[PDB]
Design a protein around this ligand. Structure first.
Ligand code: ID2
Ligand code: ID2
Lengths: 302, 309
C-alpha cells in the first residue's frame, strides 16, 4: 500500500511557522481562518483576546472569562478535530521507517494545539479552569502512527518582533500570553522526552530525563484538582494517564526559527528525514486525502 | 480468554434509568453511576443548577442567545468529562467481540454513554436555542471511537407518564422544563432511528436531498435532520464540508452501536427483569489482558466511590 508522511507544524504563534511552511506529492492543510472568523462563529480570535483584556482590566470575572474562553476553544479546534476523525481510517501502520512517500501532508498545527496547549496557556493566564483543560485532554483523539510534530524554536525578544507582525484579525499583543504560550510549548517538549525516557507521573508526582517539575504535569498540581488531603482526584489522575498515553507516541522535531524564511523552509525539509511515515489503508486513501486536504484549504483557509 | 459485557442505559431523564440499573446490579456486575459529585463540586459548582437556570434566563429574555450558548457549551463540557475519561481509560482493555455464548466474567452497567453529554443533550439544547449547531457538531466530531460491544439500552415511557414522573423525581438545580423534556425525547428518538437507518444501509449524503428491528427509516426521521441549519449552509445551498465531515463522524460512531429499547412504563422490578432479559442477547467482548478484569473492576468501583450519588 502507498505510504504517507504527516507533518504537523506547531508551536507558539508569531514565530513564522505558516509564513515559511507555505513556502515549502505535497499538500498543505492551512489554518482554518474562515472557520474561526465566520463558519463556526464570528471573529473567534477577536473574542478570545478581548475577553482576556476585560479580564485583565477587571471588567469581568475569572469565571466569566472561563466560560467565554472554553466555548471559544471548542470553535478553534473543530476543523482540526473533524480532519483527524475523517483521516484516522486511512492511516495504516508505520512504514519500515524507505522510499519517498506517495503523499506528504503539511498541517498548520495539530489537534493538541486547541485541545491542550492553548487551554493550558489560558489557565496560566487566569481565564480557564484546570478542570476544563483536563476535559479537553480527555477528549484528545488517539495518536495514530506517523504523528510528526515540529515545534518551533526562537528567542523571546525575536519572537516579540515577529509576533508584532503576525497580528491576526482581532488579536492584541499580549506578551504575557506570549510567555504563557511559549512556556506551555516548552513543557510540551519536555513532557514527550520525559514520557519517552520512561517517566511515570504517578511515581514522580510526590515532587536521565526532565524533572516532572519541568513537564506539563506540573500545571495539574492545581488546588482545584486536589482533595482536602492534597490528593489528586482520580478523574483527574485518569485525565493525566490519557495525557501520558497521547503524548509518548508522538514524534517531536525542533525547527529553529531564528533564521530566514528560506532557512526555516530549508530546515523543515531536513527534519523530514527522520519523521515516521505510514501506509494508507485503502487504494483510494491517497486520492481521498488529497481532496480532503484541498477541500479544507479552499473552504476554511483564507 | 475472559469476556466482558458492557451496557449503557441511556435516554431522557425522569424515566427511572438509575433505579433499575441499581436493581439489576443488586442481583460479577459493577455499577458506574452518574458523576453527580463531579457535576456539582469537582468539575464546577452546581452544574445542573447552572444548566437549568441559564435556559431559564434565556426564556425570561434576561440573557441573550449567545450568552446562553457560551454557558451551555461550557456546562456541557463539564457534564461529559467523567464519561469521556472513563471511556479513554477503558479502551485499551476492550478486545474483540465474543458474544451471547456463556456468562461473562464481568458485567459493567453504565449510567449513560459518552454520546449523552457529547450529542443528545447538546442537540436538545441547540433545539431549545441554548446552543449553536456548530458547537453540537464540534462535540460530535469529538465523540470517541465506538469500542466493539457497545450495547446501548435506550428508554421508552409515554409522554404523559414521563411528564408526571418528572413532576416528582427532583434533581438539585433541575427546574421542570417540559419543552426541554420533549426536546430531549425527540433527540433520543432520532438517535434510535439513526442507528438503525445506518444499519439498514442508509447514506446521509445520498439521502440529504430528501430533507432487523423495523424497516429503514427516512433520513428525516434521523439525527441528520437537525443539521439542516442555515448556519451550516454554503451560499450554494449545501452544507459546508467541515459540517458535512462531522456528520460522517456521527454515522461512523453510531453504525457499530447495539441499541436496545427498554420500556419504562412498568414497575421498578419489571424494568429490572425486562432489562435483565434484553441483556442475554447482548454482544460481549474479550479483554486485552487477563488482569483487565480486576483493573476494570476497580476503575468502575473507584469512579462510583468518588463521583456517584
Ligand atoms: O486554540 C487556539 N487558540 C487561540 O487562542 N489561538 C490564537 C493564537 C493566534 O493568535 C491565532 C492563530 O493561531 O489564534 C489559536 C489556537 I489553534
Ligand atoms: O450532558 C448532560 N446534560 C444535562 O443537562 N443533563 C441533565 C439531565 C438531568 O437534568 C441531569 C442529570 O442527568 O442533568 C445530563 C447530562 I449526561
Amino acid at each position: 500500500m502507498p505510504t504517507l508522511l504527516r507533518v504537523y507544524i506547531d508551536g507558539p504563534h508569531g514565530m513564522g511557522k505558516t509564513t515559511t511552511t507555505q513556502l515549502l506529492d505535497i499538500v498543505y492543510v492551512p489554518e482554518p481562518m474562515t472557520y474561526w472568523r465566520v463558519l463556526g462563529a464570528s471573529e473567534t480570535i477577536a473574542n478570545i483576546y478581548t475577553t482576556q483584556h476585560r479580564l485583565d482590566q477587571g471588567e469581568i470575572s475569572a469565571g466569566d472569562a472561563a466560560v467565554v474562553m472554553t466555548s471559544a476553544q471548542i470553535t478553534m479546534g473543530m476543523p482540526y478535530a473533524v480532519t483527524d476523525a475523517v483521516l484516522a481510517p486511512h492511516i495504516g501502520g508505520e512504514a519500515g521507517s524507505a522510499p519517498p512517500p506517495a503523499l506528504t501532508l503539511i498541517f498548520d498545527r495539530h489537534p493538541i494545539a486547541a485541545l491542550l496547549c492553548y487551554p493550558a496557556a489560558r489557565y496560566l493566564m487566569g481565564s480557564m479552569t484546570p478542570q476544563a483543560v483536563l476535559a479537553f485532554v480527555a477528549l484528545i483523539p488517539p495518536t495514530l502512527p506517523g504523528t510528526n510534530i515540529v515545534l518551533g524554536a526562537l528567542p523571546e525578544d525575536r519572537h516579540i518582533d515577529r509576533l508584532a507582525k503576525r497580528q491576526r484579525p482581532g488579536e492584541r499583543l499580549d506578551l504575557a500570553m506570549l510567555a504563557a504560550i511559549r512556556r506551555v510549548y516548552g513543557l510540551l517538549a519536555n513532557t514527550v522526552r520525559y514520557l519517552q525516557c520512561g517517566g511515570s507521573w504517578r511515581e514522580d508526582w510526590g515532587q536521565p530525563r526532565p524533572h516532572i517539575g519541568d513537564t506539563l504535569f506540573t500545571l495539574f498540581r492545581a488546588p482545584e484538582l486536589l482533595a482536602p488531603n492534597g490528593d489528586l482526584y482520580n478523574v483527574f489522575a485518569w485525565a493525566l494517564d490519557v495525557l501520558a498515553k497521547r503524548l509518548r507516541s508522538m514524534h517531536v522535531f525542533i525547527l529553529d526559527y531564528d533564521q530566514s524564511p528560506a532557512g526555516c523552509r530549508d530546515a523543515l525539509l531536513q527534519l523530514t528525514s527522520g519523521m515516521v511515515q505510514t501506509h494508507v489503508t485503502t487504494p483510494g486513501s491517497i486520492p481521498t486525502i488529497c481532496d480532503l486536504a484541498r477541500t479544507f484549504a479552499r473552504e476554511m483557509g483564507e
